[PDB]
Design a binder for this molecule. Structure first.
Ligand code: ADP
Ligand code: ADP
Lengths: 102, 443, 449, 67
């Protein structure tokens, strides 16, 4: 539907509201070329995955947050809190100067 | 709350007809033990009457026969009017002080000095505080306070302005001021001013304004023990040792002075003396030196009534090598009258289990109560009472609303009683470490 | 990371129905005991009960301590698990019944919301003001300090009470420092210099820190976990004030004190205010008294009263002894080494010896826990001990055999490496034979009796 | 620039493929490296695996040429 909306926008008479069909009907209206053929003077990208585990503070946040799945499942809220702690726990709870209970 | 359900939580009193000392067959959470409850009620009467000093009562009977229950029933039926000290006899073997000193402090804790005093307290909602703080501070300032019934404005003296700034007193704060001390307690925030408390978090509570006059005399009845007066006089912050411990052996001449002064306050009518109770649980853990001290401590005019419990038969007195009834020397037992607690009949076990099944949130089916009663006869009141909690937890695992026989049977199977535990020991004697230290680890 | 006796135990391995899976969470067998320990975990997680007693009863090496440590994992991190041996109770500083009470209150936890009400900024002015006292002989006294605090979005001038100036002074604050002040305690912290004038050429090794962002005055809230014993100790040895007693109480040697029942009772009142104010959750936990036969009859007679307290943890005892003499009561023998009138209070979980196939399973669980890859004939060899010898002797051979195999260049332990381990490292019984045969007569080369 | 670091993966591979193009264009001449700080054992992993399988569908739906 997101491809239709672009095709409807350019050509609303034809495209008012399987692959062997798609690649034929779009041959006039879409032009695409790629750096492999025309721009091969550039190198390719190197994509390097860099895994690192949750630090002890992050996993104290993450596991006590994941404990909410024993009651809920809000999951779309939890996957944002999980993404915060997976970024930096100070996003979820900012560490700041602290002292014993008075 | 912070009080959880505990073994004695169902005891609400002694269960005795106050007009006659006739024990009701059950009331206030006590079942049976009628003659023992009547005797404890006669002791309770002469405790309240105060005229009799330094009598000692022993509650003697087999384990689980309600000796602590009757002691707790007396404590619940004295309440705050009378000091009530509970001492496990293990407690006096301090490393800070000799055991006769520890035992003296316990006697001193059990006599109250009752002192009645008044102060003018001013209480209301702060309408305004103006303080100029004119380089220095506390120069001049005015306080407006209202109740629902009055409003007044006050010029403040400089040491009151310090108090107001020390307590960060603010418009809308509900305060009491004790005038003679000048301390300010913020009882809360008035609800009508809630929007001004922009720094207070949403968890903050609010109150309605105080009612009536801004100023009245409020009368406080303090009760302070002889031990507290002793400890206060020991050193420059002696009271601070009433909390941490770290009292030494308080010098005898300090106590002797205080006894004279408290007799003066009584004769002057400034104070009253309120004799309490010392309850010594499992008194047989005391040794022969302790009993010799108690014998004459009881002869003091400022002695409480002492109440004691013993599980022991004819048994070895501690700190010596001979045996006597209750494990207590006969010369001490000559100074003591004895209340006996008897074993329970099956219907009394049924009633106590029912009461315990009310104090915990448990529904027992009638057959489950009958089975627990049968287990009570066979395995003892305490064990069946612990099967109540266990069965409810098993029932909840199977999500049952009521405890059934199946749950009591699982409890009886999973947790052994003392006799089956002994039988397990008497069978496993090769795997269990013997008194000889010998054990076999092979299969 | 390091591997210890119980590293393989992860939990009780129960079903949701509370029945034990015959091999789960590291356990093999003890199913009835694991099911009883499950119902105890339920008793603990349901906050309703105080002062219930449990006894793990069974011979040495039957997994009683594994059961207790499994309970500690099923309860998770929030609930206080307080392990002690009965031999920890004999303090030289305070009576042994004090140590029991400290452990009872260490086993009750509190989670409490706390508002910290603070001032933070770069010190931009500091100007003391003082009075000439009448002739007390100590001379003039500072009446107040005026201090200017600058933050990123405001500034204040503070007229301090001189007890807060003593915090400022003992913190060695200067103009141009960044400081933190608690109105809760009057306490002060020097955070650093400003990042202004952060010239490198100081020998002072300063931490320059940025100006505090936000307003000078702040009112942050944080959640604190504490035990009741933490409150007892704080109030018995006061140290959070700026008064002289709090000051000197940090200079004196720390020592334990026989905290009174009077203090403990009044801290119950204080904590119940936090509950009624809604700022605290009470979270009662469990006290595990291992080797409970090492308690004496004064300890056990105190536990009577301590368990009757209207708040007390659950107490789990473990004992490994038959009919034995009660310590401190050489006249009295009883089963488990527990006084007969105290044993009436407990629920006893009897714990049983393992079968030979269970031993084989435990050996394999333990081998792969230690990372000892181990052939099946080698497993059968190790599991013939544990039957003929203690179970512990099996598990202790796995590490020597691993070393010997690796020294022999093997990737994995064969029967040969165990047969060498059996020879270098004797069990107690073979060593007891060496004693009786060599100490068969006295002499220069005899063992000493 | 010559290096792109994603602190976070996005649910849409087209946005990261656009983001990493910023350095990898007709004006570039140094090698480009892309790093992606996938924290292991977290939903950062599932976010990346879902985004990575979408890129296959988007490549399949352009199996035929647009040239
Ligand atoms: N007559 C009674 N009425 C109600 N409850 C009782 C009675 N006797 C004993 N109990 C309860 O049974 C338990 C054991 O009795 P307890 O008083 O501890 O006996 P003892 O102190 O002699 O060992 C306690 O929880 C107690 O509250
Ligand atoms: N059922 C079991 N499953 C797995 N391992 C066990 C089991 N029982 C005991 N063990 C292990 O055997 C060793 C000895 O048991 P232990 O708990 O020390 O016995 P006890 O404490 O009663 O002397 C420990 O390393 C323990 O983890």
């Amino acid at each position: 539907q997101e491809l239709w909306a672009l095709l409807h926008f350019i050509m609303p008479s034809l495209f008012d509201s399987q692959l062997k069909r798609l690649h034929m009907i779009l041959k006039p209206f879409m032009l695409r070329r790629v750096k492999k053929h025309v721009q091969k003077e550039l190198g390719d990208k190197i994509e390097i995955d860099v895994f690192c585990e949750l630090s002890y503070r992050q996993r104290a946040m993450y596991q006590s947050l994941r404990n909410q799945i024993s009651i809920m499942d809000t999951l779309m809220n939890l996957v944002m809190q999980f993404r915060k702690v997976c970024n930096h726990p100070d996003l979820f709870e900012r560490a700041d100067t602290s002292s014993p209970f008075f | 709350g912070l009080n959880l359900i505990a073994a004695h939580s169902h005891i609400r009193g002694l269960g005795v007809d106050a007009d006659t000392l006739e024990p009701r067959p059950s009331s206030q959470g006590l079942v049976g033990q009628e003659k023992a409850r009547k005797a404890a009620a006669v002791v309770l009467e002469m405790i309240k009457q105060g005229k009799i000093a330094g009598r000692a009562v022993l509650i003697a009977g087999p384990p689980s026969t309600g000796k602590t229950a009757i002691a707790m029933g007396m404590a619940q039926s004295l309440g705050q009017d009378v000091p009530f000290t509970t001492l496990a006899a293990s407690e006096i073997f301090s490393l800070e002080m000799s055991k006769t000193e520890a035992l003296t402090q316990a006697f001193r804790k059990s006599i109250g000095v009752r002192i009645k005093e008044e102060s003018e307290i001013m209480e209301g909602e702060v309408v305004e505080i103006q303080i100029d703080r004119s380089t220095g501070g506390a120069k001049q300032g005015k306080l407006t306070i209202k109740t629902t019934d009055m409003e007044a404005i006050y010029d403040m003296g400089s040491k009151m302005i310090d108090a107001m700034t020390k307590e960060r007193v603010m418009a809308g704060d509900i305060i009491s001021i004790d005038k003679s001390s000048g301390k300010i307690t913020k009882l809360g925030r008035s609800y009508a001013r809630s929007r001004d408390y922009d720094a207070m978090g949403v968890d903050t509570k609010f109150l309605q304004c105080p009612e009536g006059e801004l100023q009245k005399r409020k009368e406080v009845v303090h009760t302070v023990s002889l031990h507290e007066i002793d400890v206060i006089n020991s050193r420059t912050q002696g009271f601070l040792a009433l909390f941490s411990g770290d009292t030494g052996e308080i010098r005898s001449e300090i106590r002797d002075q205080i006894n004279t002064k408290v007799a003066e306050w009584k004769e002057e009518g400034k104070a009253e003396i309120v004799p309490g109770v010392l309850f010594i649980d499992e008194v047989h853990m005391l040794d022969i030196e302790c009993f010799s001290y108690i014998n004459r401590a009881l002869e003091s005019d400022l002695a409480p009534i002492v109440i004691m419990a013993s599980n022991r038969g004819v048994s070895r007195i501690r700190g010596t090598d001979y045996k006597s009834p209750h494990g207590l020397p006969l010369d001490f037992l000559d100074r003591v009258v004895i209340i006996n607690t008897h074993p329970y009949t099956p219907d009394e076990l049924r009633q106590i289990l029912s009461i315990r099944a009310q104090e915990e949130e448990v529904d027992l089916t009638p057959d489950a109560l009958a089975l627990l009663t049968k287990i009570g006869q066979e395995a003892g009141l305490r064990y069946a009472s612990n099967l109540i909690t266990t069965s409810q937890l098993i029932a909840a695992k199977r999500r049952a609303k009521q405890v059934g026989v199946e749950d009591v049977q699982r409890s009886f199977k999973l947790f052994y009683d003392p006799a089956r535990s002994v039988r397990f020991v008497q069978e496993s004697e090769k795997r269990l470490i013997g008194n000889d230290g010998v054990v076999d680890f092979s299969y | 990371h390091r591997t210890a006796a119980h590293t393989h135990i992860k939990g009780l391995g129960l079903n949701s129905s509370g029945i034990a899976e015959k091999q789960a969470a590291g356990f093999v067998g003890q199913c009835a005991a694991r099911e009883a320990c499950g119902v105890v975990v339920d008793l603990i997680k349901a906050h309703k009960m105080a002062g219930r007693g449990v006894l793990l009863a069974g011979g040495p090496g039957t997994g009683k301590t594994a059961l207790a440590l499994a309970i500690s994992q099923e309860l998770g991190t929030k609930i206080p698990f307080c392990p002690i041996t009965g031999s920890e109770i004999y303090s030289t500083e305070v009576k042994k019944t004090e140590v029991l009470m400290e452990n009872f209150r260490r086993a009750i936890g509190l989670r409490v919301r706390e508002t910290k009400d603070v001032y933070e900024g770069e010190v931009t002015e500091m100007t003391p003001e003082e009075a000439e006292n009448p002739l007390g002989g100590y001379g003039k006294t500072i009446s107040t300090l005026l201090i200017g605090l600058k933050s990123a979005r405001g500034q204040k001038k503070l007229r301090l009470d001189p007890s807060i100036y003593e915090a400022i002074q003992k913190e060695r604050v200067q103009v141009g420092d960044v400081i933190y002040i608690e109105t809760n305690t009057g306490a002060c912290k020097r955070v650093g210099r400003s990042d202004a004038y952060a010239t490198e050429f100081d020998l002072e090794a300063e931490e320059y820190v940025p100006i505090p962002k936000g307003e000078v005055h702040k009112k942050k809230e944080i959640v604190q976990d504490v035990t009741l014993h933490d409150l007892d100790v704080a109030n018995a040895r006061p140290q959070g004030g700026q008064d002289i007693i709090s000051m000197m109480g940090q200079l004196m040697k720390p020592k334990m004190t026989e905290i009174t029942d009077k203090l403990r009772m009044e801290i119950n009142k204080v904590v119940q205010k936090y509950i009624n104010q809604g700022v605290a959750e009470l979270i009662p936990g469990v006290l595990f008294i291992d080797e409970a036969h090492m308690l004496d009859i004064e300890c056990f007679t105190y536990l009577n009263k301590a368990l009757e307290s209207p708040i007390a943890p659950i107490v789990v005892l473990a004992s490994n002894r038959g009919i034995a003499t009660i310590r401190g009561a050489d006249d009295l023998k009883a089963a488990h080494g527990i006084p007969p009138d105290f044993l009436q209070r407990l629920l006893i979980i009897p714990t049983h010896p393992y079968e030979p196939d269970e031993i084989r399973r435990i050996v394999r669980i333990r081998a792969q826990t230690e990372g000892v890859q181990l052939t099946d004939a080698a497993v059968d060899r190790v599991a013939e001990h544990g039957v003929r010898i203690s179970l512990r002797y099996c598990l202790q051979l796995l590490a020597p055999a691993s070393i010997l195999a690796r020294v022999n260049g093997r990737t994995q332990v064969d029967v040969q490496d165990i047969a060498e381990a059996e020879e270098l490292f004797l069990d107690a019984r073979r060593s007891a034979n060496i004693l009786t045969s060599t100490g068969e007569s006295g002499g220069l080369h005899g063992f000493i009796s | 620039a010559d290096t792109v670091i994603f602190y976070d993966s996005d649910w849409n591979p087209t946005i990261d493929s656009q983001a990493m193009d910023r350095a990898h264009r007709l004006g570039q001449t140094k090698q480009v490296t892309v790093y992606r700080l996938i924290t292991r054992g977290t939903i950062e992993e599932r976010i990346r695996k879902r985004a990575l399988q979408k890129e296959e569908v988007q490549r399949v739906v352009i199996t035929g040429t647009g040239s």
